[PDB]
From a paper:
In Gram-negative bacteria, Fe3+-siderophore complexes are recognised at the bacterial cell surface by highly selective outer-membrane TonB-dependent transporters (TBDTs). These transporters bind the Fe3+-siderophore complex and translocate it into the periplasm. The structures of pyoverdine, pyochelin, citrate and ferrichrome iron complexes bound to their respective transporters FpvA, FptA, FecA and FhuA showed that the ferric-siderophore complexes were bound inside the barrel adjacent to the plug domain, a position thought to be poised for translocation. Pseudomonas aeruginosa, a serious opportunistic pathogen, does not make enterobactin but does possess a TBTD outer-membrane protein PfeA, related to FepA, that binds and translocates Fe3+-enterobactin into the periplasm. PfeA has the same two domains (22-stranded β-barrel and N-terminal plug) common to the TBDTs.
We constructed four mutants R480A, Q482A, G324V and R480A-Q482A (double mutant) to validate the observed recognition site. Each of the mutant proteins was purified as described for the parent protein, and crystal structures of each were obtained. These structures were essentially identical to that of the parent protein, which confirmed that the mutations did not affect the folding of the protein. Neither G324V nor the double mutant were able to form a complex with Fe3+-enterobactin. The same titration was carried out with G324V and R480A-Q482A, in both these mutants no binding was detected. A R480A-Q482A double mutant and a more radical G324V mutant have the same structure as the native protein, and did not show any detectable binding to Fe3+-enterobactin (ITC experiments, size-exclusion chromatography and crystallography). These results support the genuine nature of the binding site.
Numbering used by the authors: 15 to 721
């Protein structure tokens, strides 16, 4: 018996779930993998912002920490592409997230690491980590061709189709390849899907609509070559090219319109190019193991020009038609060695480092002039730089120690130096303790780290308001980036007990995060500008600021029953006890109060597999207060009732080479419609928690040819 690395040991911690390729095949998503990831315990499909802005662009949220705090990996390497899309006043981004980069049918598995076992992954892992692992080459040449198509009951809702392929195996003696390609379309919902369901709209804004889901068109291709240089050294080269164009269906920040909007309904209004290049060295040695990689990610965000303020705010700019391009260049270097240490206790020490650079060039975001609200000393009113960057060097040590058989202790320390923010120390401890052969106690506590994002950190990043979004006042203000921000830290702990024997599993876990210095728009003026025009002159100057304390707290439960040899009933239950910003007393992240996922899995024959699913969501309650900090009144208090979603499907194995699947999601056709943002603006009432579309009954087919 030799001990696994701390990285691998802590994948059995209470806060880890694994989604397999088999799981994905039985219950396939339309396109974005968030659809299947979201059904793990402690995981929500949530908007980026509590405002409800861009509220249909829902993403993976871990334990109510918000999708910003979900670090997404592909084959262990970070995806930062959504950082090319401007972060607004309310933490809103016009971005679908980073779970759409890999086609579902070329995924081997997905590792969902929540809470204390995630902290080790460093910057961005305060909520957790989602690591998408691709299917890799073997010793024979293998390959596949996978098609999926779905069929909404209601034609106003967007259909999806998808075709992908894999091919891999040995070219020469030392040389092997793996390639995948993928073509996909999730159509947008129709412009008027939410008509009849919208928030009350008056005057100039009469006839406006909050938008349904934005469509997407994917083109993805990857190529990996794996070169066995010696018996102890493998070198991998990998390139990836992914293109995502939208299909625009009327989405604007505040759900207002103009004719430039109406004109672009059904068109491409944003397109994302992601280019990835990585070189990876793996060593298998007499003493242990080695892994080192370099990844360069180039993200290009091309979209139609919008305004930052004054009623060109968050909508296509009719005076400045055309597109701009923001470019993100993200370079990540990593090295580590793994050391089985024999004497004393048989443990495994991991020693490593990491370096990252992020360069952002965004010509649209830093362009707010100071004509109206007055000039701000130290900030040029015009021609401010597009460019921003930050760097983080990291050291770490982790040790996985068998204290005595059945008991493992996993301490780890990560140190990080951010070139602007300064140093961070992230202590880590996870452990597992067998109480009997059937029952285990597992605990964890660690301090995760999230660096400020480049919009929050940039003193050239300026937003302006005539008064509507100003906290504690109704007169005009500025919101300014702040390069002396502290980084966010979160002390995340979990305690879990689990019974496990002959496929019966019963478990319960408690979690709590003490979330420190969450970066958010300031509450009090730190200055006032000078000059400007009329009543707007001498605007208050707010900054991006660190919120002292926030908390989330809840329970994750699991119950898996073997009803018969070919029949399994799997259940998870998550219950949210707290999610609060302790400064404003407001909500941190809007999640269902609970989520109960149930699956009935029947191996009906050798070649036939049938599945039933039910998911019960609890109540959703919106923000209590507006941008001013004042108590919200009217339909901005609206809450979503609890509801369920049921599904059925199967897979038929024609042979070892061909499988087909069919089924239906949302069997009882429960639909919800986006009515607006949380709170209103002039002419447009709020909609509270009614900020997204739940799709109705949707039939599906799939076919996988493989060898």
């Amino acid at each position: 018996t030799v001990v696994a690395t701390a990285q691998e040991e802590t994948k059995q911690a209470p806060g880890v779930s694994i989604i397999t390729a088999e799981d994905i095949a039985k219950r396939p998503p339309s396109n974005d993998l968030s659809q299947i990831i979201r059904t793990m315990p402690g995981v929500n499909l949530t908007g980026n912002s509590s405002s409800g802005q861009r509220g249909n662009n829902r993403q993976i949220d871990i334990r109510g920490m918000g999708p910003e705090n979900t670090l997404i990996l592909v084959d262990g390497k970070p995806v930062s592409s959504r950082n090319s899309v401007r972060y607004g006043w309310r933490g809103e981004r016009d971005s679908r997230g980073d779970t759409n980069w890999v086609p579902a049918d070329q995924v081997e598995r997905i590792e969902v690491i929540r809470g204390p076992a995630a902290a080790r992954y460093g910057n961005g892992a305060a909520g957790g980590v989602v690591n998408i692992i691709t299917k890799q080459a073997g010793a024979e040449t293998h390959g596949n061709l996978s098609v999926y198509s779905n069929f909404p009951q209601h034609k106003a809702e967007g259909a999806s189709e998808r075709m992908s392929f894999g091919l891999n195996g040995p070219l020469t003696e030392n040389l092997s390849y793996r390639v995948y390609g993928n073509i996909a379309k999730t159509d947008s919902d129709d412009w008027d899907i939410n008509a009849g369901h919208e928030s009350n709209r008056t005057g100039k804004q009469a006839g406006t609509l909050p938008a349904g889901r934005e469509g997407v068109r994917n083109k993805d291709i990857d190529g990996l070559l794996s070169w066995r240089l010696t018996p102890e050294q493998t070198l991998e080269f990998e390139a990836g090219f992914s293109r995502q164009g939208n299909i625009y269906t009327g989405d604007t920040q505040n759900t207002n319109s103009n004719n430039y909007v109406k004109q672009m309904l059904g068109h491409e209004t944003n397109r994302m190019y992601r280019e990835t290049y990585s070189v990876t060295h793996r060593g298998e040695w007499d003493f242990g193991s080695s892994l080192a990689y370099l990844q360069y990610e180039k993200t290009r965000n091309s979209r139609i020009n919008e305004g930052l303020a004054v009623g060109t705010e968050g909508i296509f700019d009719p005076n400045n038609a055309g597109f701009y391009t923001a470019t993100l260049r993200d370079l990540t270097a990593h090295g580590e060695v793994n050391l089985p240490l024999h004497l004393g206790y048989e443990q495994t020490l991991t020693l490593g480092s990491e370096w990252t650079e992020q360069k952002l060039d965004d010509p649209s975001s830093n362009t707010q002039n100071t004509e109206e609200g007055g000039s701000i000393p130290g900030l040029a009113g015009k021609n401010r730089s597009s460019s921003s960057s930050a760097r983080i060097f990291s050291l770490f040590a982790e040790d996985n120690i068998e204290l005595m058989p059945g008991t493992m202790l996993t301490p780890g320390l990560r140190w990080d130096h951010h070139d602007i923010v300064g140093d961070n120390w992230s202590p880590s401890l996870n452990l597992s303790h067998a109480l009997t052969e059937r029952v285990t106690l597992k605990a964890g506590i660690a301090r995760a780290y999230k660096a400020p994002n480049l919009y929050q950190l940039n003193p050239d990043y300026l937003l302006y308001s005539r008064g509507q979004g100003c906290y504690g006042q109704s007169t005009s203000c500025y919101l300014r980036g702040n390069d002396g921000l502290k980084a966010e830290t979160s002390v995340n702990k979990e305690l879990g007990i689990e019974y496990s024997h002959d496929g019966l599993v019963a478990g319960l876990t408690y979690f709590r995060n003490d979330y420190k210095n969450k970066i958010e728009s300031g509450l009090s003026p730190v200055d006032h500008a000078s000059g400007g025009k009329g009543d707007y002159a001498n605007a208050a100057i707010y900054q991006w600021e660190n919120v002292p304390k926030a908390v989330v707290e809840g329970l994750e439960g699991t119950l898996t029953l073997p009803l018969a040899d070919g029949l399994k009933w799997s259940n998870n239950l998550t219950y949210m006890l707290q999610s609060k910003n302790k400064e404003t007393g407001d909500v941190l992240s809007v999640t269902p109060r609970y989520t109960l996922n149930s699956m009935l899995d029947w191996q009906a024959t050798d070649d036939l597999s049938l599945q039933a699913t039910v998911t019960w969501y609890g109540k959703q309650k919106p923000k209590k207060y507006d941008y001013h900090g004042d108590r919200v009144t009217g339909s901005a208090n609206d809450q979503l009732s609890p509801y369920a979603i049921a599904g059925l499907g199967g897979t038929y194995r024609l042979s070892k080479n061909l499988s087909l699947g069919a089924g239906v999601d949302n069997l009882f056709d429960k639909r919800l419609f986006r009515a607006g943002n949380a709170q209103g603006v002039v002419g447009i009432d709020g909609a509270g928690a009614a900020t997204y579309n739940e799709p109705g009954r949707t039939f599906y087919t799939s076919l996988t040819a493989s060898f």
